[PDB]
Amino acid sequence: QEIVLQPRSIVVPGELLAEGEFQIPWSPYILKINSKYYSTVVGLFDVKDTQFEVIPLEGSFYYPKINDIVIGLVEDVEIYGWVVDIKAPYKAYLPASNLLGRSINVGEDLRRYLDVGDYVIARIENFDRSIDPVLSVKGKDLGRVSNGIVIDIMPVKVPRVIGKNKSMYETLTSKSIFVANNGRIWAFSEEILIEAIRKIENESHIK
């Protein structure tokens, strides 16, 4: 057979989603055991076309994907680069050569480039299960942040904050915000958008 057990339901680890042999791409949120598919997380069952997925409702960590745009926080400065925190299980590394467009020089490195406590907007240039993520500043409007508020959120919530065709992204800009894959948003006076972007976390499952 090939059958699905649920509509748009709230899902829990171990919950049977479907029986049959579907041709689903592998996901960390679904566990296939022979002809049965189970959720591995607290989440929202989502059927699209003939395939299905589980959307996680829970989780504080970001899983690196190559070429993701990410806003990190510098923590350590090594000899030839900067260690960066991107709210992942693994910490990211921004090479000096990447920032400079050239090799470090014989007595280089104050920190006018980047010091501890600086926010950086950056893209993941390398990552797999065998190595920590590598950052690149190359693109436009990447690099250090100077001004603005940076709001932290569940990376799990990032797709709701942007929304269908960036609809949620629109209805925030015009109210008074860059949304990274990282669960962090870089952002008028007395802009208390934060109080609303926390309310999206607390109601994403609703309507």
Binding site: I10, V12, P13, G14, E15, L16, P28, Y29, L31, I33, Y38, T40, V41, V42, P56, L57, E58, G59, S60, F61, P89, Y90, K91, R129, S130, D132, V156, H205
Partner: protein, 234 residues
């Protein structure tokens, strides 16, 4: 031995029937810092758990290339027991931390996070028997609350024998004075046992009767665990 454990009405000292569970209460998201957390109460036994993780592990040589490492602590507060417990870990706590970790190892999808640690800390706030299972189930729930992928939740209960009667979910009087106490935990949807211990003595037929009764309790508990996790979204 000392007190009567099965009364002339055929009921237990706390009024329960042999096949009846103590009342259960579950709270989730109880701690702000923890990536996930839970309080589990089964009767007067109460545990809190906190989870932190996937995160890189500093002693790299203690990490594993293909898996996350689970780091687990079962601890009882000094005021959780009838007589004060010394806060230094006991041999009992050391054993139970291992048995609880190995139960969780079967459930947590650790190969998703190579070279990381997932930290699981549990504390017994009140001990009235069954605290290893209440700890394990709080940990399971706390891991779900943390969004850490697992094959299934873990539900467990202790069965045993008291004045010759096979009984479900022991209280402290029964654990202390009864003839046998057998904690069992499972991933119920997968038909898999994650924790299994017996202390005391049973015949092989009594053991099979008890195992069967445990499964009935586990299935009830599992549904309560599922509902607790869903409750905030519905």
């Amino acid at each position: 031995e000392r007190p009567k454990l099965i009364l002339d009405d055929g009921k237990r000292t706390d009024g329960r029937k042999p096949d009846e569970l103590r009342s259960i209460k579950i709270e989730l998201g109880v701690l702000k810092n923890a990536d996930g957390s839970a309080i589990f109460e089964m009767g007067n036994t109460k545990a809190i758990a906190a989870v932190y993780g996937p995160k890189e592990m500093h002693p790299r040589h203690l990490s594993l290339p293909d898996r996350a490492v689970l780091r687990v602590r079962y601890h009882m507060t000094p005021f959780s027991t009838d007589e004060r417990k010394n806060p230094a870990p006991s041999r009992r706590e050391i054993e139970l931390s291992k048995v609880i970790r190995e139960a969780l190892e079967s459930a947590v999808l650790v190969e998703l996070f190579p070279r990381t640690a997932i930290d699981v800390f549990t504390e017994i706030l009140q001990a009235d028997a069954g605290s290893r299972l209440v700890s394990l189930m709080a940990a399971s729930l706390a891991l779900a609350d943390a969004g850490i992928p697992m094959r299934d939740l873990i539900a467990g209960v202790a069965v045993g024998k008291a004045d010759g009667v096979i009984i479900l979910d022991l209280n402290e009087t029964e654990a202390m004075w009864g003839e046998a106490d057998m904690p069992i935990a499972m991933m119920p949807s997968l038909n898999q046992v994650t924790l299994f211990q017996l202390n005391g003595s049973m015949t092989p037929d009594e053991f099979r009767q008890a195992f069967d009764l445990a499964v009935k309790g586990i299935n009830i508990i599992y549904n309560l665990e599922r509902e607790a996790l869903k409750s905030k979204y519905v």
